[PDB]
């Protein structure tokens with residue numbers, strides 16, 4: 562089983578303990594660590610933060626304590642417009658140029674592969690996404706001839722039924738991708754003003770409207786579309802989505818007036834690092850959707866939907882029973898990397914909870 566762990570570039574700028582550098586990562590923890598967001602300029606992959614080469618080096622030295630460890634670099638992300646990806650991939654000339662620029666970059670900085678985070682291809686992009694994966698992989702095979710190890714190629718895909726039908730040809734890109742990561746956590750997406758859990762596991766059978774929103778539906782679906790189990794990796798979140806209530810009501814359906822107030826370290830609306838959530842729980846009321854097997858908490862006029870050690874131990878357990886390739890964890894930096902925020906003395910409590918279940922066969 563694989564344990565893919567995303568690490569983000571901008572977690573270095575957080576104040577106090579919130580700050581995080583590749584330095585704090587346990588090398589023996591995950592199998593694959595995906596460094597977050599490279600960029601594109603003049604049609605070639607390129608750096609993003611001023612000090613990326615430095616940090617590239619720090620992350621890639623962990624492979625010195627753990628040789629089994631594999632690291633990849635990711636291109637795209639939410640704050641990277643899709644029109645941008647879309648326009649590189651639809652002109653074979655600008656496309657072929659980006660591809661050729663990739664292997665040497667990865668090699669110079671010591672990455673074992675590249676990851677595509679084209680955040681949401683559209684109806685008009687399905688065909689080019691395919692071209693890009695196909696051609697990119699071809700380029701990696703041809704390059705392994707120089708007698709060095711073949712660079713890995715992966716992709717982070719949407720888990721929303723309508724998004725998968727609209728922009729992905731799952732059957733095709735699964736042939737060329739080393740693994741596929743399922744973004745199974747943005748379900749109660751950005752819109753609608755009702756309280757709800759962003760990463761529920763099941764249908765929460767007490768809910769009738771949207772069955773397409775949950776890890777289970779998403780997974781079954783991808784399998785039907787043709788992606789093979791041994792390439793699928795299920796996304797697990799390490800952050801919580803927050804709302805500012807608009808009434809005394811706190812149960813399913815309750816009205817929302819907007820996002821939740823920012824975390825003291827995370828500084829961003831509607832979001833909360835896990836270590837922040839640990840502090841938050843003090844004086845907070847905790848509840849747990851039995852149906853979807855995921856917890857939520859309220860305190861004041863704030864309602865937080867999140868994932869704890871056991872809702873996570875559970876998602877992990879599902880993943881195994883359906884025989885998938887492994888689990889993907891979004892942001893080791895959003896977890897309690899110091900281990901001084903969530904009661905117990907453990908470091909990376911959530912990510913290691915997943916690793917425990919994954920390591921028991």
Ligand SMILES: *[C@@H]1O[C@H](CO)[C@@H](O[C@H]2O[C@H](CO)[C@@H](O)[C@H](O)[C@H]2NC(C)=O)[C@H](O)[C@H]1NC(C)=O
Nearest residue numbers: 599600601602603604605607608609610611645
């Ligand atoms: C990522 O690469 C992009 C595209 O190369 C960089 O984009 C910009 O470059 C110019 C100088 O700032 C601007 O005039 C343009 O707005 C812009 N091109 C676009 C958006 O089409 C961008 O700087 C890079 N991002 C970072 C953080 O370096």
